[PDB]
Amino acid sequence: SASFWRAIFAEFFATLFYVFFGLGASLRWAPGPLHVLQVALAFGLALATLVQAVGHISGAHVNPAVTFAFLVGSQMSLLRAICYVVAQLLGAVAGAAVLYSVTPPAVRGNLALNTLHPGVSVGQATIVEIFLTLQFVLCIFATYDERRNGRLGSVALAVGFSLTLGHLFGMYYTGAGMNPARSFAPAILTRNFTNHWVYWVGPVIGAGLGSLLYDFLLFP
C-alpha cells in the first residue's frame, strides 16, 4: 500500500534533517569550543525531535545500522530494509549537501567527517563503534518493544539520550559515527573514505549484536 512510501520519505526527510542538524552543530566555529557536550546533545535532540516527528510512520531509524538491527530482529521486510538504507544514505547526502550550501567554507571544514583519533587503531575504532551502536540499538529495541508494560515517558527522549551518551563517549575515539549514513554523507561530499569501513563494520556489528542480545538473551 502507500504507507510504505510515506515511510520511505519519512526516512529520507528525517535522515536529511538528522545529518543537516547533526553535522551542522558538529561543525567547528571555534578552534577550541569544548563542543563535545554541545554536539552530543545536538545529535540526541535531533534524533528525539525526528523520532517524535516520523516515529509513527517509519520508526525514524535514520540509521542503516538501526534498520539492519530490525532486519535481524525479524521485524522488517528485507526489501523495505534495503529501501530504508538507500533512502537514509540518499537523505544523508542530501542533508550534508544542503548543509554545504548554507554553511560558509571557513567553517564547513570536512563537513564533520568521522575520523579515527590519532592513537585509536582501526580495531579499537571498530570495537568502540560496536559498543556505541550496541547500547544505542539495545535502547531502541527496548523502547520500541510493544510489550512495555511499565509506564514511562517518551521513547524519543530515551533513544535521543542514548545517542547523546554514545557521542559523549565515542566522539573522542571515532567522532561517534554510530550511523553509517551520517558517516557516509561527508565521506562522499569530501572525497575522503579513510577508515570509512570502520563506520560501517562497527555500527552494523553493534546493531547486529545489540539486536541478538535483546531478543534472545534479554527477551526471547
Ligand X SMILES: CCCCCCCCCCCCC/C=C/[C@@H](O)[C@H](COP(=O)([O-])OCC[N+](C)(C)C)NC(=O)CCCCCCCCCCCCCCC
Q: Locate 154 and state its grid cell.
A: 517518551
Q: In terms of CB distance, is 78 or 96 closer to a copy of itself?
A: 96
> By CB under 6 A, how many residues form the interface with ligand X?
5
Which residue's C-alpha cell is 519519512? Answer: 10
CB atoms under 10 Å from CB of 205, counted, come to 18
**Contacts with ligand X, 106-145, as mask; x by CB under 6 A:** ----------------------------------------
Of positions 53, 100, 165, 188, contacts ligand X by CB under 6 A: 100
Q: Locate 114 and state its grid cell.
A: 568521522
Q: In terms of CB distance, is 23 or 39 closer to ligand X?
A: 23
Q: Which does 74 bind (CB under 5 to 8 A by kind): a copy of itself, ligand X, none?
A: none
Q: Locate 93 and state its grid cell.
A: 547526502
- Half-sphere exposure (CA, 13 Å, Cβ side) for 188? 15
Of all helices (H) and strands (E), which one includes residue 99?
helix 78-102
Shortest separation between residue 103's beta carbon and ligand X, angstroms: 9
Q: Which does 97 bind (CB under 5 to 8 A by kind): ligand X, a copy of itself, none?
A: ligand X
State the Cα–Cα distance between residues 126 and 198, nearest whole angstrom.
Answer: 5
Shortest separation between residue 114's beta carbon and ligand X, angstroms: 21
Q: In terms of CB distance, is 42 or 76 closer to a copy of itself?
A: 42
CB 43 within 8 A of CB 94: no
What sign results for the dihedral spanned by CA atoms 124, 87, 78, 54?
positive
Q: Which does 79 bind (CB under 5 to 8 A by kind): ligand X, a copy of itself, none?
A: none
Alpha helices, DSSP H, located in 112-190 = 122-143, 155-174, 180-190
Shortest separation between residue 101's beta carbon and ligand X, angstroms: 3
CB 194 within 8 A of CB 115: yes
Q: Locate 20 and state its grid cell.
A: 543537516
Site for ligand X contains 97 (CB under 6 A):
yes
The Cα-based distances of 40 to 21, 170, 220 in angstroms read 12, 10, 32
Q: Which does 9 bind (CB under 5 to 8 A by kind): ligand X, a copy of itself, none?
A: a copy of itself
Q: Which does 100 bind (CB under 5 to 8 A by kind): ligand X, a copy of itself, none?
A: ligand X
Shortest separation between residue 168's beta carbon and ligand X, angstroms: 22
Q: Which residue, judged by CB position, is nearest to ligand X in the bound state?
A: 101
Site for ligand X contains 94 (CB under 6 A):
yes
CB atoms under 10 Å from CB of 57, counted, come to 16
Q: In terms of CB distance, is 98 or 212 closer to ligand X?
A: 98
Q: Tell me which residues touch ligand X (CB under 6 A).
A: 94, 97-98, 100-101
